[PDB]
């Protein structure tokens, strides 16, 4: 349904989600957050069954922090992704499965930034860029068109501006406000909330 | 308890003390003792009455006398040093 | 001999709850008095260190808004009983929209006062004083680690409890008043304590019909100290 | 009773194995800790470097949450179990309640866990005694001690180990809370506690502080050697 | 059925109707949908009767347990949290509960919104029920943060009047409570016909 | 619900009942086991206590696999139980892997089982050291376990009465390279070394393990060979 | 009437069983790990050096546990074999969890907790086995650790076995090497350690064992080395004994 | 003596004396009397206190409308079998919707107590149950024991020095079948007064009185209807 | 296949008077197109100041009734006193929630006096919500009765009509008239009427016959 975007760069991860928490008729909430600080270089995005989202953020988020306090240092993003996909794979064939759709945004001092993408059917993925929802078609064609692997972060910002401007063009919903993060060598840096005057 | 208070009276009048003090607190402090040991308590309050220049024995001379004899003289000088109760 | 909870004497049982009755006397004392004006209660703290923060030591807790408590000796099993008791009174209000009566509170604790069991755990070491105001007004209750409960009109516990009960019986009658029982109670306290009575040695617990709430006195306490 | 399992009360009503577990606490290494007005602080003595090992693995001080700092007495592996269990517990409180985990809650967890651990059959009780410092509720500094009985207890300062009555007796002679909260008197106060160590070796002293908002700040034994230098300098100023 | 609540500068405004029907048949008009949790907490009946009555009573129980153990008044967020934990354990088992959680925090005003689908959210204005969209209409028209007390009274009272006016399922009494810093305060409860003769002119 | 061990350390540190179980093993019987270049020859000398007993009923040499033979050190009623365990365990390997189990796997698993039986106490440890053999993948093997859960590996290995005497007699008599009939030759030479004089076709009983597989020999061919095998 | 102690303190302030477990430790063979930056080695002592054996096992004290990690052992054998099956179950379980090998310490702490659960309760005999730990990671490189029956673990550079190795540890404090990661320095050094402390005359190869663990191009290979290079280490080390007797 | 410690081990005289020890624990309780007429069953016990300010401890308690019991000795077992007692009352009272015949109930009590008198791991119960009941055939007075060999009688008395009251019962068992409730009651306190030391008198607060009838529900009294029963008495023959 | 639920009929009226509580219910028992009996009082005198009326599935009324009486004995033999009416409403409501996923097909009204000796009606639903009101009529004729009561008890939709407090005998007349009028039109209602009156001095019963078709 709703949308977020997970563009991986050479040394940076540019992500942007929505702030929308509508219920089928009205938008109950226009300042929501789905960006979950897992650690100092690893982030999580999630769109799925809203009951499963919060509980899953509890288990995964607090469990990562239990690792972090426990040994004393941060996981790799890779084995963390295998951990979460492991948890979906355990959760699915059960009396209570989860139906959520994920993507991770990790950074390594050794491997640099890393981008992963999950499923509601527990699929591992490694992408240059990833998204969810119905908007992911109309966005990823354009993002496929103007992609550079070795691209500056400001071109990613501007191409994101372009892509959001086409998102207000032929999309049926409202989606006014998109929050943005960026990952670097340091870690999480919040870029500004992105909204647009329509007419 | 009160036979011990009677022996407190006996070995209290038989020495130079102060007549403004009590002894039922000491009979509480003496669970199992002989009156000879009570006399050892009274002479030990006498010893604190030697250290300081005391002839009218305060309550505290008897307090340190019992805390000497029953507590700081049971085996060594340390039966307590744990609260856990109070 | 009688080295367990399962082997009686040729005379009596296996005195080990009896050993806990022995283990009550090592605890500090506390005095509850039922006046028709209200049930008042006090305790000795026996602070040891200056680092020993005084309000960290609890003796009177609030079970219900008109129900207080008082412990003896071991603390943590009593804390389990406090948690359980507040749970179960909360069940009584939860299922009855009303306060559990302090007697049924006491019997409710007294059910698993002896449900010790290591198979099919160990017994407990704490006597309890309960203050409440039911529909019959002021109530002063006292139980034992064996759960054999009896209501007392003014009970003294802990160390030096003998002459406190005896001198209590010297001073207690039915037509007492509240503050009279308060100052008389702390008279017995400074008789039986070993330190100088101040704001830190003691604390009060005062339930009333018109003052169901606040089974306590705050620094007025200091004023009643300097009133004696 | 005998000198046997935890169930039996003595003929004078006692549990011998409790204080028997308090012996290994009493025969453990010494550690001190004081709360600052903002910068709470602590330090263990007797590092005892044996020239052939790493010492990051023998580090007796950790954290559960970022507001709280860990210390113990007695043996080590039981404290390792209590640390891991309490990481799981504070993380669980973190999961259930979205508030900074408080000191009072987790100390009730630990002392309670040792209590119900103690009541059970044939289970050797934890012969440790922990020291818990946190400043969370508006950064209010708090330290609780534990017991092998499992009685957490709020203090304003603490010292444990072999000869804690001497060191705590010095702290009674050093209890100067009138100096406001000049964390300089916290620094020189911990320098006074390590000065009043049973050896005061200068190299076997470990210390860690927190400004109630920072992380755990592990010190260096050259700034601390400068603290012993100004300590002996002020000792020269005493003459 | 339509409830609403919103926090602003001077605390929280809690407004609801009292009409409970059984399908096409009115059971009563005197139904206190705002379940008074505490002297410092209030909750709503938004979908499900014994679900809100039971589960909010159990939460009032549990906050009583918390404050008796910790000697300390609970936050609103944790109570809404544990409510969502308790509701989640029967997910998909056919339970209607979409209530609102109102109280005061040491952080200040406390407003949370928890559903049977685990839709625990915070926010500033909420309204649940059949004609709740009417209340977002007229309320989100008249909303400000810096309103006054009687301003918010006639605002939310007007909003309930419009919602019960347009819905076939909403009516009865108009319950109005006001959460302050220290604790909540009942304001009033007014008939729809009284506000009709009043509010038509 | 007892058994929180039964075994404590000695003040020396040793474990006394295990040593008494080794005393129960060594105070029993002498028999012989020899690994040859092609197969492994195991041999007992089973004389009846009376003149009445049928020797066609109980059989000390017992296969577990068709290429694996085995004997023990102790009593039959334990031996049948742990044999039944090892049989079922080998069936578990064959159910998983559909392949004949290597002998060292039975060594690890069965030795760990007996190590478990040393562990707890409401039961005695089994007073049996095993003599295991099998011609697995070209090489035959000969493995000597213990009651105490460990194991060994020998070119030849015996146990019981005069075990140092028969052991040195194998050390003197046998060597590295022999044949099957050579191993039976020195096996009877060490068998009559401490056995009684009355050694018939029904007293001695031999089972071999060719690389073609285990073969429990009969008293027919035992009477064909051991009728004055030198 | 049948509880020996199984879970109890001395009436003073110590522990009954663990002392006697340490009494069972020192009466065993001797291993060692050396200070090496580029890999690490271990030396061991062949107990039961009787000649009629088979020796087809290729390891008796060494147990290459996961891929790049092994362990010596000292104590009761098959109890520790259960600990190796359990240990490879745990690290291999961790690998199943993450597709990442262990960081090599929390495995050791886990096993210390495993023995520790037998120390507090269980009404049983704990493991009187101490053993070694070697490996490599992404965070500290090659590592050396020591197990205890006490549930403690030592982060070592030069380890210790019992009475046969106390004078060895005095030698290692006397012959502490530092900076040199050259393995053959530790080979002649350990040949001096087992040359003195082991009572094997002239350091026979069939009474000893050496195995290393070296980084190779992303593999971190493990060398369970053969005996001929052990023989030339014997001849090289006795040549160093000739160098030692040059001073006469 | 080394055999005489537990339940399972038979004595060389056959008498596992722990049962006798539980009997003595019953003997350490207060004395009490159960009796019946042909029509009306009254059981009367002795209240005692711990201190003067404390209340007097009760023994007689209600179970069912036609069931009354007194107790002596232990309390946790007493309340345990009280909860089991009322439990079984509401059990068959629920299911069969009938009041209970007494004999089947007490048989369930003895079978209930058989297991802790047999197996290792459980203690016997200090119990002084005196039983008055109303089935179709009217009043019944059963007595119990820790040996679970429950007896039926017309009147019994257990506790301290009850034997004098037993002699009183024997020399007045002819009196008891015919007289109605009030004078039968004062026969009852003319049984408890002989278990008193004769230097003190049965006061108000020290006694419990329970009456169940074929038309009378089991009802207990203290100081209030007891004073009409405390009057109309003779003094002790000094 | 097996259906667990079936409708038995019934109609309950309870009126909280000023110091009294009047609970009447018919005695007709039937199913489908067959009358089981004409004698089934759904009123059950719990205490001297609490009587319950129960309708819907009859076996759950019997079962639940016996459970209620048992827990009355639990509270009293535990607690040496009787329950208050609202405590019965609380405990009962928890019992109704206790079978949340397999409900009772049962309507329930509790009448009785408060601690002030005034009328007290707790309506119920088959899931477990409740309140205290002035008058409730459950059962088949529930919508047959409420608006007339709103005209009479609440005096609703009336202009210039003062609110006289309803007396006892006036309310008795009202009860008889509404059971006649509802008896004319309901098929689940008639043949008799069990009338229960909770005073501060006892509970009076009164049986008034109805039409026999």
Torsion angles phi and psi, residue D74, rounded to 5? 70, -145
Q: How far is Cα of residue I201 from the mean position of the Cα atoms in its chain?
A: 20
H119 has a chain C CB within 8 A of its CB: no
Residue I12 and residue I139 in contact, taking contact as beta carbons nearer than 8 Å: yes
* Interface list for chain C against chain H, based on CB atoms closer than 8 Å: 5-13, 111, 113-114, 119-120, 142, 146-148, 150-155, 165, 168-169, 172
CA distance G45 to chain A (A): 35
Which residue on chain A is closest to G105 by alpha carbon?
A71
Residue D17 and residue D7 in contact, taking contact as beta carbons nearer than 8 Å: no
Q: Within 13 A of H220's CA, how many CA atoms are on the CB side?
A: 20
Q: Within 13 A of D59's CA, how many CA atoms are on the CB side?
A: 14
Nearest-angstrom CA–CA distance, C68 and C61 = 6
- Mutate one of F6, F8, F110, F173 to test the G interface: name it (highest G CB count within 10 A): F8
Nearest-angstrom CA–CA distance, F136 and E127 = 79
Residue F158 CB partners (closer than 8 Å, separation 6+): F30, F31, F32, F33, F166, F167, F170, F190
B82 has a chain D CB within 8 A of its CB: yes
Neighbors of chain E by Cβ distance (3+ pairs < 8 Å): A, C, D, I
Contact across the interface for E78 and D98, Cβ inside 8 Å = yes
In terms of Cα–Cα distance, which of H85, H73, H82 is closest to H46?
Answer: H73
Contact list in I for residue C103 (CB cut-off 8 A) is: 80
Nearest-angstrom CA–CA distance, H188 and H200 = 17
In terms of Cα–Cα distance, which of D96, D112, D92 is closest to D104?
Answer: D112
Binding site membership of E for bortezomib: which residues?
Answer: 49
Nearest-angstrom CA–CA distance, H119 and G132 = 51
Method: cryo-EM
HEC per residue, chain G: CCCCCCCCECCCCCEHHHHHHHHHHCCCCCCEECCCCCCEEEEEECCCCCCCCCCCCCCCCCCCCCCCCECCEECCHHHHHHHHHHHHHHHHHHHHHHCCCCCCCHHHHHHHHHHHHHHHCCCCCCCCCEEEEEECCCCCCCEEEEECCCCCEEEECCCCCCHHHHHHHHHHHHCCCCCCCCHHHHHHHHHHHHHHCCCCCCCCHHHEEEEEEECCCCCCEEECCCCHHHHHHHHHHHHHHHHHHHHC
Strands (E) in chain D, as ranges, are 31-34, 40-44, 68-69, 131-135, 141-145, 153-155, 157-159, 206-210, 217-218
Residue I122 and residue I90 in contact, taking contact as beta carbons nearer than 8 Å: no
E73 has a chain D CB within 8 A of its CB: no
Q: How far is Cα of residue E21 from the mean position of the Cα atoms in its chain?
A: 18
Torsion angles phi and psi, residue I119, rounded to 5? -65, 150
Q: Do D and H make contact, counting contact as 3+ CB pairs within 8 angstroms?
A: no
Contact list in C for residue E61 (CB cut-off 8 A) is: 90, 94
In terms of Cα–Cα distance, which of F66, F41, F211 is closest to F135?
Answer: F211
Nearest-angstrom CA–CA distance, I164 and I153 = 9
- Tokens describing residue E105: 């925090």
B24 has a chain C CB within 8 A of its CB: yes
CA distance I161 to chain H (A): 52
- Mutate one of F13, F19, F112 to test the G interface: name it (highest G CB count within 10 A): F13
Which residues 158-217 of G are in CB contact (within 8 Å) with D? 158, 169, 172-173, 176
Which residues 35-94 of D are in CB contact (within 8 Å) with E? none
Parent domain of F44: 1-230
Quote the number of domains for chain F.
1
Contact list in D for residue A62 (CB cut-off 8 A) is: 91-92, 94-95
Nearest-angstrom CA–CA distance, D86 and D64 = 7
Looking up residue F168, the CATH number of its domain turns out to be 3.60.20.10
C23 has a chain D CB within 8 A of its CB: yes
Contact list in B for residue C159 (CB cut-off 8 A) is: 28
Residue A36 and residue A43 in contact, taking contact as beta carbons nearer than 8 Å: yes
Residue F194 and residue F188 in contact, taking contact as beta carbons nearer than 8 Å: no
- Tokens describing residue C140: 């002063």
- Tokens describing residue C204: 């009060």
Residue I23 and residue I196 in contact, taking contact as beta carbons nearer than 8 Å: yes
Nearest-angstrom CA–CA distance, F223 and H192 = 98
Classify residue D169 by its DSSP letter.
H
Q: % helix / strand / coil in chain I, to the nearest 5?
A: 30, 30, 40
- Mutate one of D4, D19, D119 to test the C interface: name it (highest C CB count within 10 A): D119
Any idea which architecture A1-196 has in CATH? 4-Layer Sandwich (3.60)
Residue G44 and residue G209 in contact, taking contact as beta carbons nearer than 8 Å: yes
Nearest-angstrom CA–CA distance, C71 and C82 = 10
Write the DSSP assignment of B43-78 as a string of letters: HHHHHHHHHTT-SS--HHHHHHHHIIIIITTSSSS-
Residue H161 and residue H176 in contact, taking contact as beta carbons nearer than 8 Å: no
Nearest-angstrom CA–CA distance, H39 and I127 = 49
Q: Within 13 A of F39's CA, how many CA atoms are on the CB side?
A: 22
Q: Residue H121: which of C6, C10, C165 has the nearest Cβ?
A: C6
In terms of Cα–Cα distance, which of I46, I45, I28 is closest to I37?
Answer: I28
Classify residue I83 by its DSSP letter.
P
Torsion angles phi and psi, residue A138, rounded to 5? -65, -30
Contact across the interface for C51 and D157, Cβ inside 8 Å = yes
- Termini Cα distance of chain F: 58
Q: F16: part of which helix (H) or strand (E)? A: helix F16-26
Is E99 considered catalytic here? no
Binding site membership of E: which residues?
Answer: 49
Contact list in E for residue D99 (CB cut-off 8 A) is: 75, 78
Q: H212: part of which helix (H) or strand (E)? A: strand H207-213
Contact across the interface for G21 and F13, Cβ inside 8 Å = yes
Which residues 87-126 of A are in CB contact (within 8 Å) with G? 110
Classify residue C55 by its DSSP letter.
G
- Tokens describing residue G92: 């291999």
E121 has a chain D CB within 8 A of its CB: no
* Interface list for chain C against chain I, based on CB atoms closer than 8 Å: 94-98, 101, 103-104
Write the DSSP assignment of A83-147 as a string of letters: HHHHHHHHHHSSSS---EEEEEEEEETTTEEEEEE--SS----B-SS-B-STHHHHHHHHHHHT-
| Residue D1 Cα distances to D123, G16, H191, I149, angstroms | 19, 21, 44, 77
Domain coordinates in residue numbering, chain A: 1-196
Contact list in E for residue D104 (CB cut-off 8 A) is: 70
Nearest-angstrom CA–CA distance, C29 and C156 = 7
């Amino acid at each position: 349904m709703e949308y977020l975007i997970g563009i991986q760069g050479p040394d940076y991860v540019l992500v942007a989600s929505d702030r929308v928490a509508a219920s089928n008729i009205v938008q109950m909430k226009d300042d929501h957050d789905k960006m979950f600080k897992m650690s100092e270089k690893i982030l999580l995005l999630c769109v799925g069954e809203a009951g499963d989202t919060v509980q899953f953020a509890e288990y995964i988020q607090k469990n990562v922090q239990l690792y972090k306090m426990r040994n004393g240092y941060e996981l790799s993003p890779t084995a963390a992704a295998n951990f979460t996909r492991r948890n979906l794979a355990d959760c699915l064939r059960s009396r209570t499965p989860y139906h959520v759709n994920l993507l991770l945004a990790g950074y390594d001092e050794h491997e640099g930034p890393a981008l992963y993408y999950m499923d509601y059917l527990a699929a591992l993925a490694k992408a240059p860029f990833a998204a969810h929802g119905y908007g992911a078609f109309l966005t990823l064609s354009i993002l496929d068109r103007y992609y550079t692997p070795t691209i500056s972060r400001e071109r990613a910002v501007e191409l994101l501006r372009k892509c959001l401007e086409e998102l207000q063009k032929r999309f049926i919903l409202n989606l006014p406000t998109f929050s943005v993060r960026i990952i670097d060598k340091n870690g999480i840096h919040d870029l500004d909330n992105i909204s647009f005057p329509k007419q | 308890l009160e036979g011990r208070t009677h022996i407190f009276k006996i070995h209290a009048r038989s020495m130079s003390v102060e007549r403004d003090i009590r002894f039922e607190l000491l009979a509480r402090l003496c669970p199992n003792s002989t009156g000879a040991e009570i006399r050892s308590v009274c002479t030990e309050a006498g010893m604190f009455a030697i250290r300081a220049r005391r002839k009218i024995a305060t309550e505290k001379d008897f307090l340190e006398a019992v805390n000497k004899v029953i507590k700081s003289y049971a085996k060594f000088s340390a039966t307590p040093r744990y609260m856990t109760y109070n | 001999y009688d080295r367990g909870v399962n082997t009686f004497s040729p005379e009596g049982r296996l005195f080990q709850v009896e050993y806990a009755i022995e283990a009550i006397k090592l605890g500090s004392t506390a005095i509850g008095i039922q006046t028709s004006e209200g049930v008042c209660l006090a305790v000795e703290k026996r602070i040891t260190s200056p680092l020993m923060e005084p309000s960290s030591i609890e003796k009177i807790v609030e079970i219900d808004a008109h129900i207080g408590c008082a412990m003896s000796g071991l603390i943590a099993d009593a804390k389990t009983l406090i948690d359980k008791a507040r749970v179960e009174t909360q069940n009584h209000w939860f299922t009855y929209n009303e306060t559990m009566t302090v007697e049924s509170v006491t019997q409710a604790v007294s059910n698993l006062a002896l449900q010790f069991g290591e198979e099919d755990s160990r017994p407990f070491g704490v006597a309890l004083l309960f203050g409440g105001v039911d529909e019959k007004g002021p109530q002063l209750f006292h139980m034992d680690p064996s759960g054999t409960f009896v209501q007392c009109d003014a009970r003294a516990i802990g160390s030096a409890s003998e002459g406190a009960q005896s001198s209590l019986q010297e001073v207690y009658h039915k037509s007492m008043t509240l503050k009279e029982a308060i100052k008389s109670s702390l008279i017995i306290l400074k008789q039986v304590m070993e330190e100088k009575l101040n704001a830190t040695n003691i604390e009060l617990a005062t339930v009333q019909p018109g003052q169901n709430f606040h089974m306590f006195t705050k620094e007025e306490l200091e004023e009643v100290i300097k009133d004696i | 009773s005998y000198d046997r399992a935890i169930t039996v009360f003595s003929p004078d009503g006692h549990l011998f194995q409790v204080e028997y577990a308090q012996e290994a606490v009493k025969k453990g290494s010494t550690a001190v800790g004081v709360r600052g007005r903002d910068i709470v602080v602590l330090g263990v003595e007797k590092k005892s470097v044996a020239k052939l090992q790493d010492e990051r693995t023998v580090r007796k001080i950790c954290a559960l949450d970022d507001n709280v700092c860990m210390a113990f007495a007695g043996l080590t592996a039981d404290a390792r179990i209590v640390i891991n269990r309490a990481r799981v517990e504070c993380q669980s409180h973190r999961l259930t309640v979205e508030d900074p985990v408080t000191v009072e809650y987790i100390t009730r967890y630990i002392a309670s866990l040792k209590q119900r651990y103690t009541q059970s059959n044939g289970r050797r009780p934890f012969g440790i005694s922990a020291l818990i410092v946190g400043f969370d509720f508006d950064g209010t500094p708090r330290l609780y001690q534990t017991d092998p009985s499992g009685t957490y207890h709020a203090w304003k300062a603490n010292a444990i180990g072999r000869g804690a009555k001497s060191v705590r007796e010095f702290l009674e002679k050093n209890y100067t809370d009138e100096a406001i909260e000049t964390d300089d008197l916290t620094i020189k106060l911990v320098i006074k506690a390590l000065l009043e160590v049973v050896q005061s070796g200068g190299k076997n002293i470990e210390l860690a502080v927190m400004r109630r908002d920072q992380s755990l700040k592990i010190l260096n034994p050259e700034e601390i050697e400068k603290y012993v230098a100004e300590i002996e300098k002020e000792k020269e100023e005493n003459e | 059925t339509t409830t609403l609540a919103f926090k602003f500068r001077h605390g929280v405004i809690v407004a609801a109707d009292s009409r409970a029907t059984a399908g096409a048949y009115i059971a009563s008009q005197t139904v206190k949908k705002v379940i008074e949790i505490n002297p410092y907490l209030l909750g709503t009946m938004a979908g499900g009767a014994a679900d809100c009555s039971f589960w909010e009573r159990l939460l009032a129980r549990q906050c009583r347990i918390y404050e008796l153990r910790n000697k300390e008044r609970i936050s609103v967020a944790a109570a809404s949290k544990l409510l969502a934990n308790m509701v989640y354990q029967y997910k998909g088992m056919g339970l209607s509960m979409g209530t609102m959680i109102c109280g005061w925090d040491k952080r200040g005003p406390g407003l949370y919104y928890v559903d049977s689908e685990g839709n625990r959210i915070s926010g500033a204005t909420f309204s649940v029920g059949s004609g709740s969209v009417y209340a977002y209409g007229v309320m989100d028209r008249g909303y400000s943060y810096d309103l006054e007390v009687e301003q918010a009274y006639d605002l939310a009272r007007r909003a309930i009047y419009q919602a019960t006016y347009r819905d076939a399922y909403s009516g009865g009494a108009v319950n109005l409570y006001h959460v302050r810093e220290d604790g909540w305060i009942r304001v009033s409860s007014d008939n729809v016909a009284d506000l009709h003769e009043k509010y038509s002119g | 619900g007892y058994s929180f061990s039964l075994t404590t350390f000695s003040p020396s540190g040793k474990l006394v009942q295990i040593e008494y179980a080794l005393a129960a093993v060594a105070g029993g019987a002498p028999s012989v086991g020899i690994k040859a270049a092609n197969g492994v020859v195991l041999a007992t000398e089973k004389k009846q206590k009376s003149i009445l007993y049928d020797e066609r009923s109980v059989h000390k040499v017992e296969p577990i696999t068709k290429h694996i033979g085995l004997v023990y050190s102790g009593m039959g009623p334990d031996y049948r139980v742990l044999v039944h365990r090892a049989r079922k365990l080998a069936q578990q390997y064959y159910l998983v892997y559909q392949e004949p189990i290597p002998t060292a796997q039975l060594v690890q698993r069965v030795a760990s089982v007996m190590q478990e039986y040393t562990q707890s106490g409401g039961v005695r440890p089994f007073g049996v050291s095993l003599l295991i053999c099998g011609w697995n993948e070209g090489r035959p093997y000969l493995f000597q376990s213990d009651p105490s859960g460990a194991y060994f590996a020998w070119k030849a290995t015996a146990m019981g009465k005069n075990y140092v005497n028969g052991k040195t007699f194998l050390e003197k008599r046998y060597n590295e390279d022999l044949e099957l009939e050579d191993a039976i030759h020195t096996a009877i030479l060490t068998l009559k070394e401490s056995f009684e004089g009355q050694m018939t076709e029904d007293n001695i009983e031999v089972g071999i393990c060719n690389e073609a597989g285990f073969r429990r020999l009969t008293p027919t061919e035992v009477k064909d060979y051991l009728a004055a095998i030198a | 009437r049948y509880d020996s102690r199984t879970t109890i303190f001395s009436p003073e302030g110590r522990l009954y069983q663990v002392e006697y477990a340490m009494e069972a430790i020192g009466h065993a063979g001797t291993c060692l790990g050396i200070l090496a930056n580029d890999g690490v080695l271990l030396a061991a002592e062949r107990r039961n050096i009787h000649k009629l054996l088979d020796e087809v096992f290729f390891s008796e004290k060494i147990y290459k546990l996961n891929e790049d990690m092994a362990c010596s052992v000292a104590g009761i054998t098959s109890d520790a074999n259960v600990l190796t099956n359990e240990l490879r179950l745990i690290a291999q379980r961790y690998l199943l969890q993450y597709q990442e090998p262990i960081p090599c310490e929390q495995l050791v702490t886990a096993l210390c907790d495993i023995k520790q659960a037998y120390t507090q309760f269980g009404g049983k005999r704990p493991f009187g086995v101490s053993l070694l730990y070697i490996g490599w990671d992404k965070h500290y490189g090659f590592q050396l650790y020591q197990s205890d029956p006490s549930g403690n673990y030592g982060g070592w550079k030069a380890t210790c076995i019992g009475n046969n190795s106390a004078a060895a540890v005095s030698m290692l404090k006397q012959d502490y090497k530092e900076g040199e990661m050259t393995l053959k320095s530790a080979l002649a050094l350990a040949i001096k350690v087992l040359n003195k402390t082991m009572d094997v005359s002239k350091l026979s190869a069939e009474k000893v064992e050496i195995a290393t663990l070296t980084r190779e191009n992303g593999k971190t290979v493990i060398r369970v080395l053969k005996q001929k290079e052990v023989e030339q280490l014997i001849k090289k080390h006795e040549e160093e004994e000739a160098k030692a007797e040059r001073e006469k | 003596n080394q055999y005489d410690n537990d339940v399972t081990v038979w004595s060389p005289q056959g008498r596992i004396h722990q049962i006798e020890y539980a009997m003595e624990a019953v003997k350490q309780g207060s004395a009490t009397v159960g009796l019946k007429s042909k029509t009306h069953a009254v059981l009367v016990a002795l209240k005692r206190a711990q201190s003067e300010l404390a209340a007097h401890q009760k023994k007689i308690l209600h179970v069912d409308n036609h069931i009354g019991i007194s107790i002596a000795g232990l309390t946790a077992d007493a309340r345990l079998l009280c909860n089991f007692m009322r439990q079984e009352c509401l059990d068959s009272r629920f299911v069969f919707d009938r009041p209970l015949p007494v004999s089947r109930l007490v048989s369930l009590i003895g079978s209930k107590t058989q297991i802790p008198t047999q197996r290792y791991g459980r203690r016997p119960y200090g119990v002084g149950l005196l039983i008055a009941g109303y089935d179709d055939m009217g009043p019944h007075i059963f007595q119990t024991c820790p040996s679970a060999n429950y007896f039926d009688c017309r009147a019994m008395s257990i506790g301290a020095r009850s034997q004098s009251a037993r002699t009183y019962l024997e020399r007045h068992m002819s009196e008891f079948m015919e007289c109605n409730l009030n004078e039968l009651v004062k026969h009852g306190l003319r049984a408890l007064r002989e278990t008193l030391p004769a230097e003190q008198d049965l006061t108000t607060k020290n006694v419990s009185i329970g009456i169940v009838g074929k038309d009378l529900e089991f009802t207990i009294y203290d100081d209030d209807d007891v004073s009409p029963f405390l009057e109309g008495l003779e003094e002790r023959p000094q | 296949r097996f259906s667990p639920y079936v409708f038995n009929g019934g109609t309950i009226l309870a009126i909280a008077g000023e110091d009294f509580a009047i609970v009447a219910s018919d005695t007709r028992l039937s199913e489908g197109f067959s009358i089981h009996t004409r004698d089934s009082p759904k009123c059950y005198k719990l205490t001297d100041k609490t009587v319950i009326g129960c309708s819907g599935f009859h076996g759950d009324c019997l079962t639940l009734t016996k459970i209620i009486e048992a827990r009355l004995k639990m509270y009293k033999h535990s607690n040496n006193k009787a329950m208050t009416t609202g405590a019965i409403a609380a405990m009962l409501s928890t019992i109704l929630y206790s079978r949340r996923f397999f409900p009772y097909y049962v309507y329930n009204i509790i009448g009785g006096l408060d601690e002030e000796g005034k009328g007290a009606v707790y309506s119920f639903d088959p899931v477990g919500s409740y309140q205290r009101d002035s008058f409730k009529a459950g059962g088949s004729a529930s919508a047959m009765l409420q608006p007339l009561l709103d005209n009479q008890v609440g005096f609703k939709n009336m202009q210039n009509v003062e609110h006289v407090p309803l007396s006892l005998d006036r309310a008795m007349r009202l009860v008889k008239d509404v059971f006649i009028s509802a008896a004319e039109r309901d098929v689940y209602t008639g043949d008799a009427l069990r009338i229960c009156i909770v005073t501060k001095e006892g509970i009076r019963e009164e049986t008034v016959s109805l039409r026999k078709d």
